[PDB]
Design a protein around this ligand. Sequence first.
Ligand SMILES: [Mn+2]
Ligand SMILES: [Mn+2]
Ligand SMILES: [Pt+2]
Ligand SMILES: [Pt+2]
Ligand SMILES: [Pt+2]
Ligand SMILES: [Pt+2]
Ligand SMILES: [Pt+2]
Ligand SMILES: [Pt+2]
Ligand SMILES: [Pt+2]
Ligand SMILES: [Pt+2]
Ligand SMILES: [Pt+2]
Ligand SMILES: [Pt+2]
Ligand SMILES: [Pt+2]
Ligand SMILES: [Pt+2]
Ligand SMILES: [Pt+2]
Ligand SMILES: [Pt+2]
Ligand SMILES: [Pt+2]
Ligand SMILES: [Pt+2]
Ligand SMILES: [Pt+2]
Ligand SMILES: [Pt+2]
Ligand SMILES: [Pt+2]
Ligand SMILES: [Pt+2]
Ligand SMILES: [Pt+2]
Ligand SMILES: [Pt+2]
Ligand SMILES: [Pt+2]
Ligand SMILES: [Pt+2]
Ligand SMILES: [Pt+2]
Ligand SMILES: [Pt+2]
Ligand SMILES: [Pt+2]
Ligand SMILES: [Pt+2]
Ligand SMILES: [Pt+2]
Ligand SMILES: [Pt+2]
Ligand SMILES: [Pt+2]
Ligand SMILES: [Pt+2]
Ligand SMILES: [Pt+2]
Ligand SMILES: [Pt+2]
Ligand SMILES: [Pt+2]
Ligand SMILES: [Pt+2]
Ligand SMILES: [Pt+2]
Ligand SMILES: [Pt+2]
Ligand SMILES: [Pt+2]
Ligand SMILES: [Pt+2]
Ligand SMILES: [Pt+2]
Ligand SMILES: [Pt+2]
Ligand SMILES: [Pt+2]
Ligand SMILES: [Pt+2]
Lengths: 82, 87, 95, 95, 97, 97, 106, 106
Amino acid sequence: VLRDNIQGITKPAIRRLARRGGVKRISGLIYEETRGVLKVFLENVIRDAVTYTEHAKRKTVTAMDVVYALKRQGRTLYGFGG
Amino acid sequence: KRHRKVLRDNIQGITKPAIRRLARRGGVKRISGLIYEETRGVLKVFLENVIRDAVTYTEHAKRKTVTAMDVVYALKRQGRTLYGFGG
Amino acid sequence: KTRKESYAIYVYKVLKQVHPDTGISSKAMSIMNSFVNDVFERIAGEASRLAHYNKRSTITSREIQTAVRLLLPGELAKHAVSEGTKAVTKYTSAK
Amino acid sequence: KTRKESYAIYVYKVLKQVHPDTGISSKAMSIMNSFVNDVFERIAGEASRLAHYNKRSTITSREIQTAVRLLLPGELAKHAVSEGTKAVTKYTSAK
Amino acid sequence: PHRYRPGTVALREIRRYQKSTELLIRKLPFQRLVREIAQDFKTDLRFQSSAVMALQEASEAYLVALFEDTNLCAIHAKRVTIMPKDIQLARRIRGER
Amino acid sequence: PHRYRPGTVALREIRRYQKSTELLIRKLPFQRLVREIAQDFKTDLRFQSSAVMALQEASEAYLVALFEDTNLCAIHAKRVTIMPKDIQLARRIRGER
Amino acid sequence: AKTRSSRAGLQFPVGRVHRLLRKGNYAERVGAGAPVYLAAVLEYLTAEILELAGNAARDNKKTRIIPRHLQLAVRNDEELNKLLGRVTIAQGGVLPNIQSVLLPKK
Amino acid sequence: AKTRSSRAGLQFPVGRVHRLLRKGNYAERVGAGAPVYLAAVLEYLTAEILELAGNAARDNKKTRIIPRHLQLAVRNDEELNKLLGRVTIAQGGVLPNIQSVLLPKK
DNA sequence: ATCAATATCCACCTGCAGATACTACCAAAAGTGTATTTGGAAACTGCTCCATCAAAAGGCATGTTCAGCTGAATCAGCTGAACATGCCTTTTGATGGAGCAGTTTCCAAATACACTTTTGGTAGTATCTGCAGGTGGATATTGAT
DNA sequence: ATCAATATCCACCTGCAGATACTACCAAAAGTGTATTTGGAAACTGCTCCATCAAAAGGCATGTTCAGCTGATTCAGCTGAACATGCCTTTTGATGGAGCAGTTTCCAAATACACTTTTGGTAGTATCTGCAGGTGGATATTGAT
Ligand SMILES: [Mn+2]
Ligand SMILES: [Mn+2]
Ligand SMILES: [Pt+2]
Ligand SMILES: [Pt+2]
Ligand SMILES: [Pt+2]
Ligand SMILES: [Pt+2]
Ligand SMILES: [Pt+2]
Ligand SMILES: [Pt+2]
Ligand SMILES: [Pt+2]
Ligand SMILES: [Pt+2]
Ligand SMILES: [Pt+2]
Ligand SMILES: [Pt+2]
Ligand SMILES: [Pt+2]
Ligand SMILES: [Pt+2]
Ligand SMILES: [Pt+2]
Ligand SMILES: [Pt+2]
Ligand SMILES: [Pt+2]
Ligand SMILES: [Pt+2]
Ligand SMILES: [Pt+2]
Ligand SMILES: [Pt+2]
Ligand SMILES: [Pt+2]
Ligand SMILES: [Pt+2]
Ligand SMILES: [Pt+2]
Ligand SMILES: [Pt+2]
Ligand SMILES: [Pt+2]
Ligand SMILES: [Pt+2]
Ligand SMILES: [Pt+2]
Ligand SMILES: [Pt+2]
Ligand SMILES: [Pt+2]
Ligand SMILES: [Pt+2]
Ligand SMILES: [Pt+2]
Ligand SMILES: [Pt+2]
Ligand SMILES: [Pt+2]
Ligand SMILES: [Pt+2]
Ligand SMILES: [Pt+2]
Ligand SMILES: [Pt+2]
Ligand SMILES: [Pt+2]
Ligand SMILES: [Pt+2]
Ligand SMILES: [Pt+2]
Ligand SMILES: [Pt+2]
Ligand SMILES: [Pt+2]
Ligand SMILES: [Pt+2]
Ligand SMILES: [Pt+2]
Ligand SMILES: [Pt+2]
Ligand SMILES: [Pt+2]
Ligand SMILES: [Pt+2]
């Protein structure tokens, strides 16, 4: 019963996110569209965090790596250091 | 110094045809009648914000003259970087 | 082992001055500390730029003041300026 | 009668290299001078931050390289990293 | 036999999830996805637990906010149902496209 | 007596203004607006003419870009006429709110 | 000896703020008042948020401030909201808000 | 006495770039390779834009690059567009682009 | 379709704004060379805290039904585009004069050690309690008739 | 309307994850004092370029007309919400080990510092040239019929 990791972001999970976003009714094609959007979001952020890891010559991505990555994508996060 | 004219309602100096031309450059084909006041409104907000910061830079430098550079710094700060004026 | 500095103790103090009966979870304290680091960076960053623009070698309270004016919204700016001007006077007029 | 530096002559050299019969208007040159400064500020800035994050007091070609990777998109980053490495290698061998 | 009308439970869920702050994606599936995406940038990486957590927080913040804009776009077109073209428009206007 | 149908001159003007780069707002009316607004912040200021020109290039690029977003919001609504609700939507999604 | 925080009449650490400015590469030099001014400003804004975050805690029948209370304080204050308009407070959630057109027809 | 530019085989002024890193207050120390690498990235980027801008000038039967040519060059290239996604080139105008549904008939 | 109004597309075409050219200077870069300090790489290791996995938990995939939403079609009514017309306002080129900015002089303020006292962070340790959920029971809300 | 199903609200209960107080310690801030360097205000004035202005040059304001767009109305049929649960994926918490992070070390490369050479900026004065915008005059594009 093999499955893509992206598909692990399930319809009901996406449905909950939408709900917190105040969405009442959801078209069927939205779930695939959302997974795509998340994938681009994560690629851009992880790419940058990993760049921060490599520069530091570590093999572990630290929270700070991510926080720095977020800060420079203009999506500042509070709660994880820095 | 002896007298200097009073500035009022200059927003109306942004005419209907001027706004229409801007909308054309923006690819707009049909413009509803209320667009013109909305746009003047939006523009005055844009200018207040830019001029306020630029003027702040001016005063900090202790000058009476707002420079191209003051404007270019004000824009940079608001994430609307401008090329072509020493900036 | 290596020293890890945080604004936490001083945040806790201020909380005690402001809601003496109220406490703070770790996670919230972590947020408050980010917030303090973030704002320092923003204000220092801008002060730094102002000094350069004007070909000065020093970041003085004047630069910090203008930085606060450029960065903080109106009412928040006004109070911050006064709080800050107040502390520099108090600091001067004390042996 | 103070001196104002620009990248103009360097921009012109390079322009002759790539389009030998093409001129540049002084407004276009002004924009080009702004572009160069802007990119310089964005790379040095990332470089600055990156060093701090790693507790280093030296900006090296290695900080610049990561800044370049952070700042430039995809294919421009790839080519810039070559051009930079190339010039440093060449420079290392040449004294 | 009892039945709630289409949208009654939806409203009930909006209220519920707008009250709370827990992550709405299951931790493990999200972690695999994070690692797969990272594998394409560097091989054999490990992840601080808080690092994955930071990413989840940021991703869910992001998507929750995009659904607000999306919903305004649906409503602008006089619908109550969000469609990919709403997501698309929100992103284009945000300067993401 | 000859007449182009509504829409035809509009498209002609789009091609026309999309092709050129001159400022579209008259200079002096714009300079006055700048002085009015600035004076309301601080009296007795002067402006280098390049400061005013810099403000104009910035403001016109800002308004042209907003009209593109606004146009997209109207079309999303299945209209071809831009309205204040379109501009308000563009600005809301842009974070200008 | 008397500390500069106490001289300035402040909980926030003037010494630390001073050091951080020097080692932050902001300028070749740093005036004496600047870390004072800056520490004041930081203290103030911290008091402002904690103030409102406290209330939000009380409003919700609670004594310990959590991330949710900082979120509600920030996004219900027009000014704090703008200053943090591009910030995400982890574990903060969102404001309860439903678009009216989505409300059931009464 | 060979300039460091020539040693690295570069048009852009390495001396200048080294100097500006010091005065810019970016770190305590500047490494010898850094202005070399940076001056090369700077020169690569300006070559890329002048290449494409010259093409636009030529596509237009013009001999001098003007601001509109820089704008067509940047906006027509996916990567330069993104790198200067939040920059305004004075006197560049916009790319001709009219939305489908606005065109006449069917 | 064919006819006619009127915008559009070249091609050449003279004036000139702004681009390119030289000859001189020169302050300030940029380079060169040796004396002096040190940041950080290199290498060894201790112990967090990370990936793996077994056992325990509890959310989601599943198909059916149909409520109510979306999008197609039709259309009255009215708003905004085109254009004619009459003329105000902006653009353009010329000029004494405010303020920027160029140079020099000088001390209040900062950097730099050095030495003296401290506090903030950690870590072992034990000690404490706010509140997440559990419960159970009344009460509101929704939907059926 | 009444009615019954099921969600929600509330008061009270309690174990424990996570908040807090208390002690000992030290390395490292943080400060105090003494020796030195300088950054930039001040006091003055050359001189670029800004506010001001008169004449000249072209865009804006207005009102009328109706083409076609918006927004209202209705409707059919398509599409997503609601539904119930045990399979199966995630969660939890226990355990070796990888690598982050602390420590010591030592020199390749940093800064500083003083004469030595070069060059990029401007400024004064000169000749050159690409194209903006005028022209007429052959090729579309549009909209009436
Ligand atoms: Mn109080
Ligand atoms: Mn006024
Ligand atoms: Pt950190
Ligand atoms: Pt400048
Ligand atoms: Pt976690
Ligand atoms: Pt759709
Ligand atoms: Pt102008
Ligand atoms: Pt409308
Ligand atoms: Pt800096
Ligand atoms: Pt040198
Ligand atoms: Pt050392
Ligand atoms: Pt070291
Ligand atoms: Pt179970
Ligand atoms: Pt139905
Ligand atoms: Pt009609
Ligand atoms: Pt009308
Ligand atoms: Pt005078
Ligand atoms: Pt004067
Ligand atoms: Pt001055
Ligand atoms: Pt101390
Ligand atoms: Pt202590
Ligand atoms: Pt103590
Ligand atoms: Pt509870
Ligand atoms: Pt219960
Ligand atoms: Pt119950
Ligand atoms: Pt009823
Ligand atoms: Pt208890
Ligand atoms: Pt000290
Ligand atoms: Pt000096
Ligand atoms: Pt005219
Ligand atoms: Pt006329
Ligand atoms: Pt009609
Ligand atoms: Pt419609
Ligand atoms: Pt039906
Ligand atoms: Pt379906
Ligand atoms: Pt079950
Ligand atoms: Pt172990
Ligand atoms: Pt090992
Ligand atoms: Pt190991
Ligand atoms: Pt290491
Ligand atoms: Pt030269
Ligand atoms: Pt020379
Ligand atoms: Pt010259
Ligand atoms: Pt022409
Ligand atoms: Pt003609
Ligand atoms: Pt003609």
